[PDB]
Nucleic acid binder design. Sequence first.
RNA 1: AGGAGUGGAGCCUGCGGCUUAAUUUGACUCAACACGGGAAACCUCACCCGGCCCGGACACGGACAGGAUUGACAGAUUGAUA
RNA 2: AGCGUGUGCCUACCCUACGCCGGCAGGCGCGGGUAACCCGUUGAACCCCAUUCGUGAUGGGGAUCGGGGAUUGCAAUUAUUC
Lengths: 55, 72, 100, 120, 96, 171
Amino acid sequence: GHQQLYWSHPRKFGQGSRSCRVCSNRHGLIRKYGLNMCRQCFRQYAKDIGFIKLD
Amino acid sequence: PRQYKIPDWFLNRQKDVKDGKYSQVLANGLDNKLREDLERLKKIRAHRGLRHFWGLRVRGQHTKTTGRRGRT
Amino acid sequence: HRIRITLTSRNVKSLEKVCADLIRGAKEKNLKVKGPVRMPTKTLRITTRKTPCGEGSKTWDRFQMRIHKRLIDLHSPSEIVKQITSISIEPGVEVEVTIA
Amino acid sequence: FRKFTYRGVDLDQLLDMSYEQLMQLYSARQRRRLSRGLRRKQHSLLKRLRKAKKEAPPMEKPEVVKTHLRDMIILPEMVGSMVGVYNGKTFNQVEIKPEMIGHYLGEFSITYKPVKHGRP
Amino acid sequence: MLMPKKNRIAIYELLFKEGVMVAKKDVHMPKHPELADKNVPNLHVMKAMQSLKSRGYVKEQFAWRHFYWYLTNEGIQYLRDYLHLPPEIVPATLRR
Amino acid sequence: MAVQISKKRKFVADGIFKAELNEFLTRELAEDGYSGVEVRVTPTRTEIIILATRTQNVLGEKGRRIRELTAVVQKRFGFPEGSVELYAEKVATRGLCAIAQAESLRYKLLGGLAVRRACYGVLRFIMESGAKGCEVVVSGKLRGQRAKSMKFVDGLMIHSGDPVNYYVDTA
RNA sequence: AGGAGUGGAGCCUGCGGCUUAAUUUGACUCAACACGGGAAACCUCACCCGGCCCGGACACGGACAGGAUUGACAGAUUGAUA
RNA sequence: AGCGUGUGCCUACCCUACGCCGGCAGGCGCGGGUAACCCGUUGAACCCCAUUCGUGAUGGGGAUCGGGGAUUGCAAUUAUUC
C-alpha cells in the first residue's frame, strides 16, 4: 500500500508539525499566544492584529 | 562494602558486564578494569571503541575547534 | 441577585466611557452599585528582529498590547440587567455578564 | 577462551529466557526500549533472521540479511548472523558476536570515514 | 484522479446547495471542517474543483491557507445537466 | 463556551480574525474599491461592515456577491448558521482614504497609462478632496532595466513623532 | 581619569580550512563570524545514498464496455506486511 | 525580589499545589488554575551568621572518561537531556 508511507510518520510534535498560518514555513514561528505565525509574516500584520510599537 | 550496609548506588562499578557483581574498584583494579572495557569495545569494532583507538572525543563533542593540546 | 459584569477592552477611554455608562443606567434604577474595580492591566510583550533576513546590525521591536479589565457587580434580578447591557456599547469593549 | 558471560550468565542461558527478566538484565536505555515495545517493522526483521539461520548448513555461517534499522538492540537471539547494516550509502556486513549484546547495530556500521589531513 | 465517483456527486451538490465552499490548502487531510459526515479526502476535492476553473466554471481567491470557489453563471447550468437537476432550484446565494 | 480559552488568547484571536478578512477582501473587492472593514459585537451576532467606494458594485446582481461573501465567512471560520451578517456601506470622502487611492492608482498603470500621468491625476485629485498634503512614491523598474524611484510629493506632510499615527494613513 | 574585561587556559558555539556519498547554503572593515530569530536525532532539509507516487489541470487525436482502466493476501523480491 | 507564563480550531501536547514510593533524577495518586482567584505571601541566588579546610594545582579548578539509574520520543549509537 502506498498510503502507509505517504503520511504515516507521526507529526504530533517537532518543527515539521507546526507551520505559519500565512507564510507556511517553519522558521521564525511565533507560537506564543497561539499566533502560529512566523516572525516575518507577523511584522506586516503586527498592527491590524493590534500590537503597537508603543515604547 | 556490601556487608557493611553500603547501598548499590555508591559503587563505581555497578552491574559488571562479566560477573554483574556490585563492587567498588580500588586504584589497581581500577585502571586494569579500565583497559578491559576499552579493549572490549575495540574487538567488537564498536564506534565508541574506535574513537578511543584514534584518540578522539567519544561522548560526541565537536572536535572542529577544541581539543588541540595533545594534537600537536 | 449578586451578579458580576466584566468589562475588558483594548482601548482605555473607550472602556472608561462604558465603565461609566453602566453607572448611568444603574443609578438611574436607584439601587446599590459596586464601584468599578480596576484590575491590574496585562501587557503582551513580543520582541522580534526587525530584519527579514539575518543581516545588518541586530535591532529588535517592542510590540505590545496592553489589555484592560474592570469589574462591576450589581444586586439585581436578570431583566433589569439585560435592558441596560444593550445600551450604547462600542465594538472595542467586551462585556461579560455573570449571573452568579 | 573462557565462556562469554553477560552480567554473570552465559550465552546458552540467555537464549532460553523470556524478555520480562531480560529487561533488568542490562542497561536502562535498552530496558526502556523493550518496555516501550517493538514495532512490526522490527519483528519482521527477527523472522528474517531465523529464515536466514535455519537455511544455513550446520557448518556454514548463515546468509547475509540487509536492513536500514540502525536502531535495533543486539539481543541474544541475533547471535551468529550476517547483518548488512546500512550506513546511508552502503550495507557493511558485520557478524554479531556474543560480546555485542546490549548495543545498537548502528554502532558497528560507521557512517563517516575517519579523516586524515596529510598526504592526499 | 481515479477517486470514487460517489465523492464527485456529493461535492458538486455540496457546491450547488451553497454557492461557494471553502477548503484549506492541506493535501495531508483525510477530513473536512465542513464535509465531516464522510471520508471525502481533501486532496481530491481541491484538485476536483481546479478542474472546474480550468474549464471555467468557478472563481478563486486565497486567504493565506484557503481556497474560495465561486461558481459562475456558466457553472450552475453545468450542474443542471451533469447531476440532472430541474431548472427550478438555485443556490442559496441566488435566493434572498 | 466549550473550551473556554483565556482572555489573553481571545483578544489575539479576533486580531487574527480581522486580519484575515482584510487580506481576503483586499484580494477580492479591490477592483470594486475596498477600503477596510469593521466588526461590531453583539450577542450571537457579529455584523461586519465592508466600507467600499462603489457599494452598488459589491452587491453584484441582486445582492448576490454579499450573499457569496457571507457564505465563505460562514464555512471558513465555522460560524453558526445565521449568526453573522455582512453589509456594504459607502466610504465618506473617499479621496482621503489612502488604500482607496492606492488601488485606484494601481489600476491606472495596469490600464497602460503613463507612470507620470497617473501620479499627477491621483495626487491633485486628493488635493481637491481636501487634504493637508501627500506623497506618492512609485518605485520599481522604470525606463529600462535598472530600477529607479519617482517621488511625487506636495503640501504639508510630516514623518516623525506620535502624530504620524493618526494624521497620516499609508498604503 | 578609571572600572570590568577580551586576547592566554578548558569548554560551548559561529566562520574558514581540511576531510567526506554529503559534510546544504546566505553574509566577509565598521555595516559578516550565539547572525539567517539557524539550541538540525526523524521532521525541519535546501545536502548524500536509495526507494514509491503524479497530486502531468485543460484542449486535441487514436484505445475503450466484446471493458479504457484502479485496488489486492499469498511465494520470490524489498528495508518496509511499498 | 520583580518581570512574566500557564489546559491550544488544525493541536493529538499546559502551569502546578497536596499525599505517598525512591538517595537522586523520577514515579503513583488526588485536587486547583483558561488565571490580581490556583501554582504563589512566587520562602531565588548573591549576601548574612556559624563550622571545616590552610597557600599545597590544595576541600582551587571540573576538562576528559568508565560503570549504573531515569525521563521525552516511533527512534538517542555519533553518549537528547537528567
